Amino acid sequence: PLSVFGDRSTGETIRSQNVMAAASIANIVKSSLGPVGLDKMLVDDIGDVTITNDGATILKLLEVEHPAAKVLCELADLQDKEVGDGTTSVVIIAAELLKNADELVKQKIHPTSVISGYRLACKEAVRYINENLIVNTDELGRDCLINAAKTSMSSKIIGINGDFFANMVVDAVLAIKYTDIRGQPRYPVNSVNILKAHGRSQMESMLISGYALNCVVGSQGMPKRIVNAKIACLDFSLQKTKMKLGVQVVITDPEKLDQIRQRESDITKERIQKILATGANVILTTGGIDDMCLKYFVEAGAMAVRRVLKRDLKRIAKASGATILSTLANLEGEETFEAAMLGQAEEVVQERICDDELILIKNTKARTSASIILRGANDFMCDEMERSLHDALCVVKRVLESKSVVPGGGAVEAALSIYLENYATSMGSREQLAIAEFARSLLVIPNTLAVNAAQDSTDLVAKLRAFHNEAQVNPERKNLKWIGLDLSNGKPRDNKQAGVFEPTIVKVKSLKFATEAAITILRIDDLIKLHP
Amino acid sequence: MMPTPVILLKEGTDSSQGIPQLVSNISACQVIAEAVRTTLGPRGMDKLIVDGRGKATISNDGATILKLLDVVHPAAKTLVDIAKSQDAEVGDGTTSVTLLAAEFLKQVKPYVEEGLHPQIIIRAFRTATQLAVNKIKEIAVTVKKADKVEQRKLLEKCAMTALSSKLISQQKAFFAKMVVDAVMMLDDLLQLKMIGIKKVQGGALEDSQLVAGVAFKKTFSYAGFEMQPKKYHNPKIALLNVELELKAEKDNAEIRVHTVEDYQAIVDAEWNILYDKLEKIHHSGAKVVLSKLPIGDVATQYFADRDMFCAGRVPEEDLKRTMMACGGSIQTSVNALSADVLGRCQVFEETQIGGERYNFFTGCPKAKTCTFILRGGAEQFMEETERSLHDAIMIVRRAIKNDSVVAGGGAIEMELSKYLRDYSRTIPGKQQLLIGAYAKALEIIPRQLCDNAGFDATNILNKLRARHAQGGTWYGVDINNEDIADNFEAFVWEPAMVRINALTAASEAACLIVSVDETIKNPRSTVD
Amino acid sequence: VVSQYSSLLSPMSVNAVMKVIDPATATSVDLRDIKIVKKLGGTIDDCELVEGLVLTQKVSNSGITRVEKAKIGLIQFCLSAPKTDMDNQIVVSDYAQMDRVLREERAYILNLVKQIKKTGCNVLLIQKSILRDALSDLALHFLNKMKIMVIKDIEREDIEFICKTIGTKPVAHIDQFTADMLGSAELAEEVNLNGSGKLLKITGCASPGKTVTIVVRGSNKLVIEEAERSIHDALCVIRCLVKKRALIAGGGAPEIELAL
Amino acid sequence: LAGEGISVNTGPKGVINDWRRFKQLETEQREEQCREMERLIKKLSMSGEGFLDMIDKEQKSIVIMVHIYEDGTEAMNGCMICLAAEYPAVKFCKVKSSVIGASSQFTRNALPALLIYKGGELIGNFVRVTDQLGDDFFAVDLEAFLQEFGLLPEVLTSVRNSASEDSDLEID
Amino acid sequence: TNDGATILKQMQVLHPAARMLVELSKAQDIEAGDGTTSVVIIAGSLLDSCTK
Lengths: 532, 528, 260, 172, 52
Ligand SMILES: Nc1ncnc2c1ncn2[C@@H]1O[C@H](COP(=O)(O)OP(=O)(O)O)[C@@H](O)[C@H]1O
Ligand SMILES: Nc1ncnc2c1ncn2[C@@H]1O[C@H](COP(=O)(O)OP(=O)(O)O)[C@@H](O)[C@H]1O
Ligand SMILES: Nc1ncnc2c1ncn2[C@@H]1O[C@H](COP(=O)(O)OP(=O)(O)O)[C@@H](O)[C@H]1O
Ligand SMILES: [Mg+2]
Ligand SMILES: [Mg+2]
Ligand SMILES: [Mg+2]
Fold this sequence. Notes:
This is part of a larger assembly, with 1 copy of chain A, 1 copy of chain B, 2 copies of chain C and 1 copy of chain D.
Chain A: E1 6-10, H1 12-29, E2 40-43, E3 49-52, H2 55-61, H3 67-82, H4 87-106, H5 111-132, E4 135-136, H6 142-153, H7 162-175, E5 178-179, E6 185-186, E7 193-198, E8 206-208, E9 210-213, E10 225-226, E11 229-234, E12 247-249, H8 257-276, E13 282-285, H9 291-299, E14 303-305, H10 310-320, E15 343-352, E16 357-364, E17 371-376, H11 379-401, E18 404-407, H12 411-423, H13 431-441, H14 444-452, H15 457-473, E19 483-486, E20 491-494, H16 495-498, E21 501-503, H17 504-522, E22 526-530
Parallel strand pairs in A: 7-17, 11-13, 13-14
Antiparallel strand pairs in A: 1-22, 2-3, 4-18, 5-6, 8-17, 9-16, 10-15, 11-15, 15-16, 18-21, 19-20
Chain C: H1 6-20, E1 34-40, E2 53-55, E3 67-68, E4 71-75, E5 90-92, H2 95-118, E6 123-127, H3 137-145, E7 149-154, H4 159-166, E8 183-192, E9 198-205, E10 212-218, H5 221-242, H6 253-259
Parallel strand pairs in C: 1-10, 4-6, 6-7
Antiparallel strand pairs in C: 2-9, 3-8, 4-8, 8-9
Chain D: H1 10-14, H2 16-37, H3 48-56, E1 64-69, H4 73-86, E2 93-96, H5 97-100, H6 104-109, E3 113-118, E4 121-127, H7 130-133, H8 139-147
Parallel strand pairs in D: 1-2
Antiparallel strand pairs in D: 1-3, 3-4
Helix pairs in contact in D: 4-8
C-alpha cells in the first residue's frame, strides 16, 4: 500500500533497535571508566595499531552504521570539543537514560511525559550541583590544580607518574597564561606544542621553558647554537626571483640577457642583505630556501630554518615579540627591515633526541611559552601519553577559568540520585516516574566504576546512597556530600579530602548533552530506510 | 589468542562466556515471551503460523504457538519446555509461565549486569517461590460440603474462566456446560481417550452437540449396504474383531486335492465357514455388527437380508468407546457370542451431518464415554475449538481431583506480590532487592491483561496495589467495566494448582537460565 | 521537539517577524529577510536573535578583532596587481624595467590601500572573486599595518542582505569609494563558540535595516535541523497572522464543528 | 493471438518494487562490468565492491595503481613494496583476479598486470610485462621504466609532531 | 523530523496519487507554512469516503 522502495520499522521495534544500538555503543567503552579501567587496542584493515583509553578517540576510529550509534559518537565528539574530559561518562549516561526512558515507554508512558520529566530532572540536577556540590578553588591553592590534574590522568598510561605529570601540566598551563580585555585570565591551551619522541622512560619527559620546533637547520654549515638570538620570522620564500604570470621577458638586444639573469638572483641577495644588516641571528620562514640563500646565511654565521609550520611560527613570533612579515614593503614603497621586527630569545639550540634533532628556542622574552617533549617506549605509548596529557591540560584550563570543582568518584552522581528521587514526589503525576528513572540512570557511573574494580557493586553503591541520604536528611551532616568511592580499597571515602576533584563544567555539560541526546533519540518511533 | 597449529577443540567451535552471554540469554527469553505476549486474557488475539509445506495453524494456546515456533536458541528452548510441562501437568497457563519467567529474568537483568553472583539470585528465587506456593495453598478457597449443585457450579465457573479467552468465548457457557457434563460421566480415571472429539465442517458453533454415547463416521460401506435399515429402537450390538469375508484360511495354508469332488467340497467348505460365522452372529441376537477388520460384500448382503446394520474397519478407539458406552466386549472369536458380550443402546441411527454420514449410539444409561461433534466454517476453526475444549476438559479434571480455587484476573498475583514485598521488607537487604524484584515481576500478568484490553496499565496497577494493600484479596482486572472488581464475586475462578505449577515452572526455568555461565556450540556434523 | 524550549523560541520568533516588517500597512512577510544560521555545539537553549548579521567567513587580518565604532566598507573590486579585462602582458627587455615592474606594482597596491584607509574605514568586506586574486598578500599586509579588519570571500548572493542589514553601498571601483558609502556600526567582533567554531557578529548599526538573524545551536546536527524547521514553522504561522488576520481555536475544534 | 497493443498500464506502477530492486542489482553488476571491460579486449587484444568503491573514491590528482595477481610475482611484489617505501604519497595496492572474476584468457596469459588509475580513467594499462621488463629486474629498473613515460610522481622527523583555533595571544 | 512536507518529500513514494499528495503538502507549506500533515490526512480521509 505504501509502495515505498525501502524497509520500514514502527512502534516497539524501532525503539528497541535504537536502544540496543545505544547500549552496544555504551558497552563498547564501559570497560575504560575510572582508574581501574583498562585501555583498548584498535587495529585498522592495513595493520595500523592504536592503543587508547579516551572514549572520543575510540568512537571516532570505529565504523558505525546505526544512526543512534552515530548520534552517541557525535555526542562524545562534541563533549570532547567543548570540555575535553568526560567523553566516556557522557556516552554511558546517555545510553542509560535512553534505556530507562524506553522501559518507561514500554510501560505505556507517553514519550512526551518522559521527555518533560528528563528536562525537569536535568534542570534540577544542574541547579543542585551549582548550589550544593561545588567547591571554591580560591582557598585550596595550587594543590587543587595538582589534584585535578592527577584525577584527570588516572585511568591513563601516565597515571602512576601523576605526581610528576601534574606538576608538568600545571607549570605549562600557568606559563601560557595571559589576560585579555575586561580582565579575564584566559589560558590558551593548544599553544603548548606537544612533541613526541620514543626512547628513555616517561620520567625523562621535558617541559621546555620556551618553544620546541620539529624541524632542523636547512644547511649543515650553519651553527647549531646561538646565545643571543635575534629571531626574524618571515612568511615568504627565499629563492630565485621569478616574474608573475602577467610579466614576460622578451629580448631584442642580446647584450642585456646577462644583466637580466644577474638581477634575477641579486634581488633575493639584496633582500637577504637587508635582513642580515639589522643583526638578525635566527631566521624562520614558512616557505622554502634554496642553496644560494642558505650559503648566504652560512657565511654570516646565522641560523635559517625552512618549511616552518604557520601555527608554530605564529606562536614563536608572539612569544619572542617578533612580528611575521609576509613581505619587505614599508609605507613609502621601499624594501626595508627595521630592528623593531626582531624577536629575542635567551638561547636557540638544535638538540638531539633519540637519533633525531629538533630546535629549542629557550627562554623567550616579553612572553612566557611552554612546550612538552614526551619520551616513551614506542610510538603507540607516546601517542597515548599525548592524548592523556591533552586531557589533563584541558581539565586544568577548565579548573583555572571557572574556579568551581566538584568531588569525583561518583559522589556527585549519588547525591544527585538521592536528591532527584526525593524531589520527584513534589511535581507532576506522570513526570515523577521520569525523574525517578533519571535519578536511577545517574547511578550508572559508580556502578561501572565498582564493576571495573571487580568489587561488590551492589553493596558499595548501597553504602554510598545511604551516606548521601544521611547527608541530605540530617542538616548537621553536610560533610558527607563529599563521600566518593575509593576504588583501590573498595570502600566509601571522602573524595574532597582525598583530593579527587573535577571541573563542575564537565558534569554540567555531560548532563545537558546526555539529556539532549536521549530526548532526540526518544522522539523517534518510525524508521524508513530507502534502498540505495 | 594465537592460531596454535594444533588446536584444542574442533575447528569452528563457538564459545560464549561471561556476563554478556547471560544478558543475551535473558534477551532471547524476552524475545520468546513477546511472541505469545498478546494472546493472554479475554481480549487476547490469535497467532497464525505457516510451515514450510504451507499449512497454516491458528491458535491462541501458548504451548501450541511455542511448539510451532522453530526455536534454536539454547536458552530460549527452556521457555518452550516449561510451556510444554505446564500443558502436560495442568493444560492451562501455558501463556502465563513464559511471561512470568521472562519477567523474572528482566527484573534480575540489572543486578546481573552489575556483577551480582548468580547463586544469590537463585537462592532468592527459590525462597520467594516457596513462600508464594505456601501462600497460595493457605489462601485458596475450598468448600468442604460435597454438595452436588455447588460443586457442579464450581466446575462450570472454572470451565467458563478457562474458556473466556478463545474464539468460542461468546458461547462459553454452552461449551462449559457441555464439558462439565462430559467429564462427569467419566468413570474413575478421567482418561482423555474416553472423550471422543469429532470435527465436522459446516454449521455454527451452537450446532455442535455432545452425544451421551458414541458416534463415528461411516467407514467405506460395501455394495448392498444401502439396503440395510438405518434405525433401530432397541438393538443389540456385536462388538467384534473379526474379518468377515471370503479369504484364504491361513497365509501359509495350502490345499492339495486330486478329485473334482474334493474341489467342490473345498469351495463349499470355504463358503460354509463364512456362512457359519455369519449364522452364529445372526443367532447371537444382535442387530448391529461392528468390526475392526474389514467386513466383505458377501457379509454385507447377508446382514442386509436379515435386516441388520454392519460396519467394518471401525477404528480401535471408536470400538473402545462403543464398548464402554453400550456395555459389551470386543470379541475376536464368534463361537461364544453370549448375551453379556453384546452391547446395548436405546437408539441407533445413521444421520447426515454437514455432508457426512455418522452412526449414532444414543440412549445409553450407564455410558462412561462421550463424543464431541464440533461444527465450524474451516478446519482450523474446528482445530482451535478442539484445543479450547481440551483446555477446559483438563481444567475440569483437575478441579474434580481437588476443588481448591483462587480468583483470576491477576488478583492472586497482586496478593502474592503484596505478601512477598511485605516479607522482603523484613530481611537484611541483599535478598530484599531480589525478592522485591520477584514481587514486581509477579505483576506482569495483570499489566499484560490491561495492555491487551487497551486499558491504561499504570492506573489499574496502582488501583489494584492500593486495594490489596489496605485490605482485599480477590480484587483483579475487570475487562468489561474498564476498572477493577472483586473477581471471586465475579466468578473468575482458577484452580490453585494451575498457579502453583505456573510459579514452580517459571522459577525453575529462571534459575536454570541464570545458573548457566558459558555456552559452547560444536560444529554441525552431516549438514546434508 | 522544541516544545521544551518553546518558552525561549516563541518570543524569539515573534520578535523576528515583528522586527522585519512594518506592523502597520503590511500584507506579507518576506521570510528570506530572516537569516537562519546553524552552528553545531551547545544546546537549543543557546539560540540567539542577533539584530545585525553574522558572517561565517573568518578574518584574514589575523591578530586584530573586535573593532569598535566600525565603519564597514563593502568592495567588489580586487586588491591585487593591475589586470585589464583585455588580455595583457608586461614585456621587460632591461633589468631596470624588471625592478620597476614590482616597484610600481607595490606603489599601486599601496595607493589603493591608502585610498581605502583615507575614508575612515576600519572593517573591509571583499566580494568573492574567481577570475583574479581578490586580496593579495601585499594588500593584506598593507591593510594590517593600517589596522583594518579584512574579510574576503563574501558570497555574491549575500551582497543584498549585507547591504540591507548594515547600509553599506557596494563599491566596484576605487574612484567611487567614498566615506558616504560606508555603513557605521556599533561593534564588529569575531567570537568563538566554546571551541566549536568561530562566528563574526556585527551587532548595533546606525539606521538598522529590516533584517534579523537567528543563530541555532544544538548537541547534534539532527536536532539543529529540526529546530530550524520548527522555527520556520513558527515564522510561517506569524506570517499567516500578518495576512488574513483571523484566529480560530485549535485542538480539533474546527474539524468537529465542520463535521457537525 | 491478437491484441499486440498490450498497454500494460497499471502493471509497471503496481510491481515497481521488484522492478527497481532488479534494476539496482543489475546496475550494481553494471559498474563492475564497466570497470573490468576497460582491461579486457581494450588492452588484452593488443571483494569486487572493495575494488569498485576504492577506484570511485580518492582524489583525481593522485596516481593510484593496482596489481592483478594469482597464487615472477614475488619479485615484482617486492619491487612494488620498495617503491611504496620510496613513494609514500602513492597508494600501491593489489587484488586477485579471481576476486574480480576476470576472463580466463587474462588469467592464463596475462598474470602480471600493472594497472594505473588517475582520476577514474586508465592512463596506463601495462599487461603481461614479462617480455618488456624481465623476470628478476630490481625496483630501480621498474621505477625508471615507469618514470620514462611520465606517469610516476617526481627530511625525517623524530616520530611525530601533529596533534579551538586560539593559537596564542598575549594582547591585554 | 515531524514536518509533514519534509516527511512526505524525503521518501520516494513511487505512486502517482502519493506523489500528488506530496505536491499538495508542498503547496500547503508554501501558502500557509504549517498544517502540512493535516491537509494530507484530510485528503486521505476524503478519498476513503469516496471509496464507499
Ligand atoms: N582517584 C580516583 N578515585 C576515585 N574515582 C576517580 C579517581 N579518578 C577518577 N575517578 C572517577 O572516575 C570517573 C571516570 O573518569 P574517566 O573515564 O577516566 O574520564 P573520561 O570519562 O574523560 O574518560 C570520573 O568520573 C572520576 O570521577
Ligand atoms: N473474565 C475475566 N476477567 C479478567 N481476567 C480473566 C478473565 N478470564 C480469564 N482471565 C485471565 O486470563 C488469564 C488466562 O489467559 P489464557 O490465555 O486463556 O490462558 P493462560 O493462562 O495460558 O494465559 C488468567 O490469568 C486470568 O487471570
Ligand atoms: N496544546 C494542544 N492541545 C490540543 N491540540 C493541539 C495542541 N497543540 C497543537 N494541537 C493540534 O495539533 C494539530 C497538528 O499541529 P502540528 O503537528 O503542529 O502541525 P500539522 O498541522 O502540520 O500536523 C493542530 O491542528 C493543532 O490543532
Ligand atoms: Mg577523564
Ligand atoms: Mg487459559
Ligand atoms: Mg503545526
